[PDB]
Design a protein around this nucleic acid. Structure first.
Ligand SMILES: [Cl-]
Ligand SMILES: [Cl-]
Ligand SMILES: [Cl-]
Ligand SMILES: [K+]
Ligand SMILES: [Mg+2]
Ligand SMILES: [Mg+2]
Ligand SMILES: [Mg+2]
Ligand SMILES: [Mg+2]
Ligand SMILES: [Mg+2]
Ligand SMILES: [Mg+2]
Ligand SMILES: [Mg+2]
Ligand SMILES: [Mg+2]
Ligand SMILES: [Mg+2]
Ligand SMILES: [Mg+2]
Ligand SMILES: [Mg+2]
Ligand SMILES: [Mg+2]
Ligand SMILES: [Mg+2]
Ligand SMILES: [Mg+2]
Ligand SMILES: [Mg+2]
Ligand SMILES: [Mg+2]
Ligand SMILES: [Mg+2]
Ligand SMILES: [Mg+2]
Ligand SMILES: [Mg+2]
Ligand SMILES: [Mg+2]
Ligand SMILES: [Mg+2]
Ligand SMILES: [Mg+2]
Ligand SMILES: [Mg+2]
Ligand SMILES: [Mg+2]
Ligand SMILES: [Mg+2]
Ligand SMILES: [Mg+2]
Ligand SMILES: [Mg+2]
Ligand SMILES: [Mg+2]
Ligand SMILES: [Mg+2]
Ligand SMILES: [Mg+2]
Ligand SMILES: [Mg+2]
Ligand SMILES: [Mg+2]
Ligand SMILES: [Mg+2]
Ligand SMILES: [Mg+2]
Ligand SMILES: [Mg+2]
Ligand SMILES: [Mg+2]
Ligand code: NA
Ligand code: NA
Ligand code: NA
Ligand code: NA
Ligand code: NA
Ligand code: NA
Ligand code: NA
Ligand code: NA
Ligand code: NA
Ligand SMILES: [Sr+2]
Ligand SMILES: [Sr+2]
Ligand SMILES: [Sr+2]
Ligand SMILES: [Sr+2]
Ligand SMILES: [Sr+2]
Ligand SMILES: [Sr+2]
Ligand SMILES: [Sr+2]
Ligand SMILES: [Sr+2]
Ligand SMILES: [Sr+2]
Ligand SMILES: [Sr+2]
Ligand SMILES: [Sr+2]
Ligand SMILES: [Sr+2]
Ligand SMILES: [Sr+2]
Ligand SMILES: [Sr+2]
Ligand SMILES: [Sr+2]
Ligand SMILES: [Sr+2]
Ligand SMILES: [Sr+2]
Ligand SMILES: [Sr+2]
Ligand SMILES: [Sr+2]
Ligand SMILES: [Sr+2]
Ligand SMILES: [Sr+2]
Ligand SMILES: [Sr+2]
Ligand SMILES: [Sr+2]
Ligand SMILES: [Sr+2]
Ligand SMILES: [Sr+2]
Ligand SMILES: [Sr+2]
Ligand SMILES: [Sr+2]
Ligand SMILES: [Sr+2]
Ligand SMILES: [Sr+2]
Ligand SMILES: [Sr+2]
Ligand SMILES: [Sr+2]
Ligand SMILES: [Sr+2]
Ligand SMILES: [Sr+2]
Ligand SMILES: [Sr+2]
Ligand SMILES: [Sr+2]
Ligand SMILES: [Sr+2]
Ligand SMILES: [Sr+2]
Ligand SMILES: [Sr+2]
Ligand SMILES: [Sr+2]
Ligand SMILES: [Sr+2]
Ligand SMILES: [Sr+2]
Ligand SMILES: [Sr+2]
Ligand SMILES: [Sr+2]
Ligand SMILES: [Sr+2]
Ligand SMILES: [Sr+2]
Ligand SMILES: [Sr+2]
Length: 237
RNA sequence: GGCGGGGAGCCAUGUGGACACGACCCGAAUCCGGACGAUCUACGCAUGGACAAGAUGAAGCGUGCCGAAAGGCACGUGGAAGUCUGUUAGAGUUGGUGUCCUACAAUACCCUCUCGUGAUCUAUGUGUAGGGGUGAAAGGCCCAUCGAGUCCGGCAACAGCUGGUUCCAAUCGAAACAUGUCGAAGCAUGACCUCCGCCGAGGUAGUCUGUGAGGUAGAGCGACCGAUUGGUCCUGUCAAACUCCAAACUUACAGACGCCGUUUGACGCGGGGAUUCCGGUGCGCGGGGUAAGC
RNA sequence: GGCGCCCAAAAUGAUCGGGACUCAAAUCCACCACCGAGACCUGUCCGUACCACUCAUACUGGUAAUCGAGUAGAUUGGCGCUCUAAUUGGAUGGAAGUAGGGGUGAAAACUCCUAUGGACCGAUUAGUGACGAAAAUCCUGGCCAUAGUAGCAGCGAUAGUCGGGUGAGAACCCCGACGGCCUAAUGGAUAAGGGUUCCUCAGCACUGCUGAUCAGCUGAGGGUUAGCCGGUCCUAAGUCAUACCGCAACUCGACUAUGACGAAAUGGGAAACGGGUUAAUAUUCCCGUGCCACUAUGCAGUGAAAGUUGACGCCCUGGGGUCGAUCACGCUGGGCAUCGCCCAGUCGAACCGUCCAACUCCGUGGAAGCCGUAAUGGCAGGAAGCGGACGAACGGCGGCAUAGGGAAACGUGAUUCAACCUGGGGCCCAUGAAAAGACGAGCAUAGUGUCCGUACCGAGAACCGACACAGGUGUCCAUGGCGGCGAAAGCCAAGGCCUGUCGGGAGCAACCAACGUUAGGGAAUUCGGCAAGUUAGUCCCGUACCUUCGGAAGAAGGGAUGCCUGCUCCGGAACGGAGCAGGUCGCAGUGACUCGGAAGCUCGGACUGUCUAGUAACAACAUAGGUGACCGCAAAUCCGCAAGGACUCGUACGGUCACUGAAUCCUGCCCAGUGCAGGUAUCUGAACACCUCGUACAAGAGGACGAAGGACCUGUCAACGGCGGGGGUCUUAAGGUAGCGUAGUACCUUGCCGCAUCAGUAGCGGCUUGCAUGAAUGGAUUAACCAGAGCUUCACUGUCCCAACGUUGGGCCCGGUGAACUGUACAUUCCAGUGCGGAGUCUGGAGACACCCAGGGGGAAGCAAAGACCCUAUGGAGCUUUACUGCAGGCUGUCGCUGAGGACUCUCACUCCGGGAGGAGGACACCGAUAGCCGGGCAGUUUGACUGGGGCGGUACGCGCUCGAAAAGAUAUCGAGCGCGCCCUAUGGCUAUCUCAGCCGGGGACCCGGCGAAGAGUGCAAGAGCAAAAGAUAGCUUGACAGUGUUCUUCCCAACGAGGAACGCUGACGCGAAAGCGUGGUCUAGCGAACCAAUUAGCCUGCUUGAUGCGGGCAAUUGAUGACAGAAAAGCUACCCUAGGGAUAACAGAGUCGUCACUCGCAAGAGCACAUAUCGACCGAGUGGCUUGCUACCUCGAUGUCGGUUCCCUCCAUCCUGCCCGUGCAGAAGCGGGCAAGGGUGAGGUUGUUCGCCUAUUAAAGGAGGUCGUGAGCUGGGUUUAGACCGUCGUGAGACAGGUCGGCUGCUAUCUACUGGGUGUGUAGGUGUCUGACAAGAACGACCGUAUAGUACGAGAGGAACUACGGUUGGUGGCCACUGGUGUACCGGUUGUUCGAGAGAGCACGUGCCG
């Protein structure tokens, strides 16, 4: 047959790439020599193309102007800080260790210094739970108990733009416009509506997959489609 | 039992034929390699551009009235919308199964028709390349080419299938069948045709007679077998898979006559070359089928 | 008994070949004479064979009654062509070749003569071959018919005409007049692309849809001038180069660095305007004026980099404001002349200076309800007011300008205001570039400002499309006037053009294209209202069901509409808008143009949107919404061989993988199979290492351990899918819940009832047993939407009844230009027949004087394309899968990397995070290697044959018997009957003893006797064999033995293996007295190659040699290929492709005739009695060729399918009409029958239908043939490609003799045929009138009514006829006084616009519209 769409994806052509040349900035945490002593002022609020969420532009003391992964509540004029001695207030960034247990955090690093990896989407947030001299347990937006190095930096608060999902797109056109800002090929043709040559579920006089949809995880790309390594399906039971 | 044994081979030239190779010539759909194509088109991206006029009148705001308030009602304001009308520009194409159909045109003309502020249309630039792209998915599109582009190369691909294969004459003259075969549109081996060499005296297409073989026609069944009538032993019927009988006829061998052979060498043996293995008709006998130019 | 007669019906024109024949030219019985082959006889010759002579196959003689045809094929002699050699010749006193002609040879061929030609050419012998053509849809070249034919018409752009100029020549080259065409283009400027097409002169052989003096053509010259217009500079998506790394390698490859590249209309950007000038350039040259950058010098200045700019989305909108347009008045010029109107102009840049609205801000002030807007809004955090700072135009004003331009005047105000400037508001799950540069940052003067582009076209002739192509092709001129909402129509300017480039004739016929108008009827037409039409702009009134409350809605329905006079209101006003009163014309006032027909029911998809470039726009795809799945990021998913990469400037409110498909109500039961996932005591589970055996080692055999996987268990269906049959459970887990239901799913089926219609296979409602509905394979339902499917109604109409007239362009004639298709030949046919069964060419007749014009297309199974359907090929390709075999990929173990102290700690490799310090991890992971599992993701293939085509079914695919099989042998079919693929240690072998089925008699056990050739038994089919046995019983025994052959069989004849049998020799045995019997069962079925393995007993052998291990071999046994003389092997294709086949199917033809239709014979029976008024069973005999079937003869290098339609001929088995007979005939009317084919046989409702059902009319509303007549005539509804849905089936691709929506119809007529028209010849200078062989007709068919007559007849009821009249209908020929239609002659009314008004006219498509 012919390669399925998920395989055309990998080659990374224009159709499947994200409009990077139109993206603003990775919002990785700023690096601090040490002893904290790093504060800045929120000069403006902007719209992050890549995330459909607002982001804040900060001017730090040493004259460095950078966009920051803004939590909900940051406003122009406000003063943010990044370092160990940072004051425990919304918008501030400090090691999971200096953060009191029970505080909502966002843009959590996976490895100290990586600049944040977890909880950066609209309205989401990780809940810090346990502390220690060896590990800091964080509860990620998926509800997973994550064990992190207490030296991993994070921001206090939840990410801006909460409830973005509450409103429906209503029309294809709206969907269209957002898709046009991500690395995603849209719209989607159901494989079962394709010719047998184009996809595992293609062909047949009437549309219906010609096999069970739950594919093994060791299935080769091109064959791995439908419900991947499903532990179960349906809602019943 | 098998193979071998009483000295003929080697080389050369012409010629018949076999096998591999392009293998008498042309003939088609492939498969593979390396290349050239996104000037068409599909999708994305960058930078630009286009959308008369009109209709409808969302939220929001206002005013008045009513209300304790929540708010309600009226009028106005406002100007939303993958909103409406629209040959504005522009995009498209439902029907005429109109015109054209050696065209104006290898997709055109006319009228009607659909879209026309958006998932819109559009110019240029740019990206994705062949088992790979691109695809709101029609196997659609990737330069009149797509269920795997184009060019050249492999390459003079292979075919048991169609077509064709060029001067005269003389001698003989088929097979359309049997056995085997992934065999039935093909082959091989036989049968049969022809050519060469060997052998050396008989041969046998006709008839008659003698010694044998036979159970078909017919006939018959108180001769088997199995069918098949009636009357109170007689009375009525049959047979591809019945036979107490039984031809014509066909056939083995021999003799006789005939014909034929011993310079035309028969009968027979060895070797070279085939073609051939879709047949048909009449007559006799058929088996199937109502029948048939079955 | 002979001949005949009845029985006896078929489609274009009858037949014995024809004529025709009657004491025959018939039939039969005898006879007589003749005609008639290549046969037979005869003369001569030839070939061949044989004989004699001979060296000879050279002569010569002889023989042939017993020689003389031939496809495929075998054998042999000869002709001709090229060049070589040897020998030997010819030619300028004329070679070869060619043309015409003579001679020879059976012939291939040889040779001569004459002409031409003008230089080479042979013969013999031996060689050499790119050695011979009628054919291949063969190749290349040339040429004819086609043909003076088609085209040079069709497009909303109908374009010309009269004079004249030039010229050898003028419809189309130029001037003028008159007449027209184009208005987002037919005008102006340009991008791409072209490349000199541009200008001039001179030309016309070429190019040009005709001509040409013209030209984008030919010849020769010439033409493009820049500091300030582009390029150049900057960076965009993105590209490349170098480095680095990968790769066997590179011209290859991703990342990361660096550099460079990447924008000519249309991204950013230092600076130029106005005028003049040329044949052709022009912000470039010239004149005037201006500006920018750099540099130099001088003065000033120390500021200089913070910041601003470059620099930005979509929607609404206010303010400033120019051009334009318009209004007012003045000036200059023009036009018109019943008036007094109408037109043009009235100019003047860059630049320099200056003015500033908005936004922002400051001072003052002091609002506690005021300020402000189109709107939002603003304020004690300080409103209005007042003053101030900053601050705009491509704009105003002054200069520029006794610059320029104008014949002249050389205006002033206003309104609406493109450009340009500056604000306010709203929107985003969407956030709307970057960089160079500029400003910030003065003034003088001077110098410098190079390089490249610059013509022209930019399109119905300069680009792409082969063309001077009706196609395609980017930007801007979007503000010219009237009009109107308008960038709409229509008309008209500026400007352009008559080149969407052949013309001339005919009231100009038929026919066609595109139109106009049609009385009455009004969808009757058709599959379907297809096509056309109806409606229409604007204002007022008014508006249903339903509904997601948005909508439905312009629902529907009704009314108004011009002009003129005078006014009112809103507004600052408009040359803006809304109204009032009075007057008044027309058939008609949105008068043209522009400009919806409307309503209801049902199906589908929610909606806008997408799609098959080129037959499908849809119900298909998408969508929001719903749901499930994977993943914590060192992730999931995906690309790469690798180096690396997309997702990702992303992080679960994410994004990957899938299903469903808006909203609303909902979404039942099943985990057995399959799939995925988790678990798992035990079982199973590979390699390395380890152990045992073996080997001086190794191969090898076995063991222990045991990863993932599997067995096992569990979870899961919004996973794949399933929810039946039986009874009051069974399979296979469950057994179909809510809904819905004859469905786009219901075969039966036009289901049954109802609605609607004259009549409804339709549609809708209900019922509903659902052949075979059903819940995210989503169910039900649904407002809105729709070029989606079906139905109904109102309105309207030439769709139709039924056609007519007209308009424009063709057609026809003439000048000029000038193809193609097609062509074996011949060809004036027709009716029959024949023939490979579908003939212009054969046979028999008939007809036929030749040639030409026009026509519509009957035939040439017309032309076009080596049929695409179907089958066949040990063909191809795409697709599928639990087909065969493999390859990636993932998971998992193990070895290496890899280190220290069955489980653990550590650090030092290695990995990741961090800028770094260091942090996290860690001998794991990554990487390399290997092993097990998963693995249509991918590759290569296979998937047989037979067959009354193929498939399905079956096997007649290997064997045995009877019959078929025709008395030797052999012998076919999907022929008839039926078997074998074993079984048996005895059911084998021998010997002894004995005789069996069955029946009878005496005491179904047993005993005795009798009859008893064989009917018993003998393992199994069938046929055959057997009686002191081949059977039975008893006993004994292992010959069911080893070796090696002969012969036959397999395979008749006649080659072929395995297998089989009969018969020998040798060995060893058993039984018997012995002869002898035993090589399995009485005979014919019970079977299997090579390679490899195992096994049996000897022996041969392994590379210098010896030993050991482990191999190689001679003979044979066993293991299977049943497709059985042996491949390891599944499907789909309608997306298809190729080779071929009429070797084979689908249409039609042909044969047949069971089937079908019709007839006849007999006549049981019934018909109250009565066979025969009428009906008529059984059985029997036929005719037709209309149904169906069979066959496979014709056709696969094509004969288009059903139905309809239109138009022509025919048949009779007659439905009506005419004339008759019978009756269970009073009459009237029936019923049945006979002759008879002249004429007629119609309109409508469902359905594609044929057919049929139904309705009303009717004299009756018959059937059939013509390639199931009729597609080079129509239609395209059905069938039957490519798209899609449903049901059923299938794991899947996909299928269906099911349903459903959509889906293309080529061609210029050569011949023949006929309808009409001509020219010739014959008869044989003329005019006029006739004749009538033949030919055609339906020229006429049918009905109603009145008198007859309320009569005959009849109890009555009812109710005729002859004949004479009147009329209607269908058909036919003709005509135009009458009625009607047309009537782009004509006359009139009137809308818009242009000519100033008036008058009179043009355009609004071939009449603007109307009468
Ligand atoms: Cl999204
Ligand atoms: Cl000869
Ligand atoms: Cl405003
Ligand atoms: K055919
Ligand atoms: Mg969602
Ligand atoms: Mg989808
Ligand atoms: Mg599809
Ligand atoms: Mg398809
Ligand atoms: Mg597939
Ligand atoms: Mg579906
Ligand atoms: Mg489905
Ligand atoms: Mg309003
Ligand atoms: Mg010959
Ligand atoms: Mg001869
Ligand atoms: Mg007999
Ligand atoms: Mg010689
Ligand atoms: Mg030749
Ligand atoms: Mg002609
Ligand atoms: Mg010029
Ligand atoms: Mg032209
Ligand atoms: Mg009809
Ligand atoms: Mg007023
Ligand atoms: Mg229906
Ligand atoms: Mg739709
Ligand atoms: Mg199409
Ligand atoms: Mg969805
Ligand atoms: Mg369910
Ligand atoms: Mg294949
Ligand atoms: Mg495959
Ligand atoms: Mg192959
Ligand atoms: Mg025989
Ligand atoms: Mg064995
Ligand atoms: Mg065989
Ligand atoms: Mg045939
Ligand atoms: Mg053929
Ligand atoms: Mg008759
Ligand atoms: Mg027909
Ligand atoms: Mg025809
Ligand atoms: Mg046709
Ligand atoms: Mg035609
Ligand atoms: Na003899
Ligand atoms: Na012309
Ligand atoms: Na106007
Ligand atoms: Na299950
Ligand atoms: Na294919
Ligand atoms: Na027809
Ligand atoms: Na008649
Ligand atoms: Na009908
Ligand atoms: Na036909
Ligand atoms: Sr990051
Ligand atoms: Sr980083
Ligand atoms: Sr499928
Ligand atoms: Sr459930
Ligand atoms: Sr392009
Ligand atoms: Sr719209
Ligand atoms: Sr159509
Ligand atoms: Sr039309
Ligand atoms: Sr066409
Ligand atoms: Sr519209
Ligand atoms: Sr080739
Ligand atoms: Sr015989
Ligand atoms: Sr002869
Ligand atoms: Sr002969
Ligand atoms: Sr002969
Ligand atoms: Sr040749
Ligand atoms: Sr010619
Ligand atoms: Sr013309
Ligand atoms: Sr035309
Ligand atoms: Sr001339
Ligand atoms: Sr010119
Ligand atoms: Sr550049
Ligand atoms: Sr530019
Ligand atoms: Sr204004
Ligand atoms: Sr120019
Ligand atoms: Sr054009
Ligand atoms: Sr003009
Ligand atoms: Sr011309
Ligand atoms: Sr008229
Ligand atoms: Sr109708
Ligand atoms: Sr009708
Ligand atoms: Sr009205
Ligand atoms: Sr729903
Ligand atoms: Sr299960
Ligand atoms: Sr014609
Ligand atoms: Sr025997
Ligand atoms: Sr199957
Ligand atoms: Sr299909
Ligand atoms: Sr008759
Ligand atoms: Sr009658
Ligand atoms: Sr029917
Ligand atoms: Sr059709
Ligand atoms: Sr004559
Ligand atoms: Sr009467
Ligand atoms: Sr009466
Ligand atoms: Sr006119």
């Amino acid at each position: 047959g012919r390669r399925i769409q998920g395989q055309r994806r990998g080659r990374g052509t224009s159709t499947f790439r994200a409009p990077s040349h139109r993206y603003k900035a990775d919002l990785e945490h700023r690096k601090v020599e040490d002893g904290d002593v790093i504060a800045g002022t929120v000069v403006d609020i902007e719209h992050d193309p890549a995330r459909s969420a607002p982001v804040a532009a900060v001017e730090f003391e040493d004259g460095d102007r950078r966009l920051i992964l803004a939590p909900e509540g940051v406003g122009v004029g406000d003063e943010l800080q990044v370092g160990v001695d940072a004051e425990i207030a919304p918008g501030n960034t400090l090691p999971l260790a200096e953060i009191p247990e029970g505080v909502p955090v966002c843009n959590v690093e996976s490895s100290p210094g990586d600049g944040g990896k977890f909880a950066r989407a609209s309205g989401v947030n990780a809940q810090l739970l346990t502390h220690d001299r060896n590990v800091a347990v964080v509860k990620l937006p998926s509800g997973e108990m994550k064990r992190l190095d207490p030296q991993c930096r994070a921001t206090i608060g939840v990410v801006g733009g909460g409830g973005r999902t509450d409103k429906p797109f209503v029309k294809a056109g709206n969907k269209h416009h957002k898709m046009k800002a991500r690395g995603t090929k849209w719209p989607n043709v159901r494989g079962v509506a394709m010719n047998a040559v184009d996809h595992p579920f293609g062909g047949g006089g009437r549309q219906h997959p010609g096999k069970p949809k739950s594919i093994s995880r060791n299935a080769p790309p091109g064959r791995k489609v439908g419900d991947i390594a499903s532990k179960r399906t349906g809602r019943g039971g």
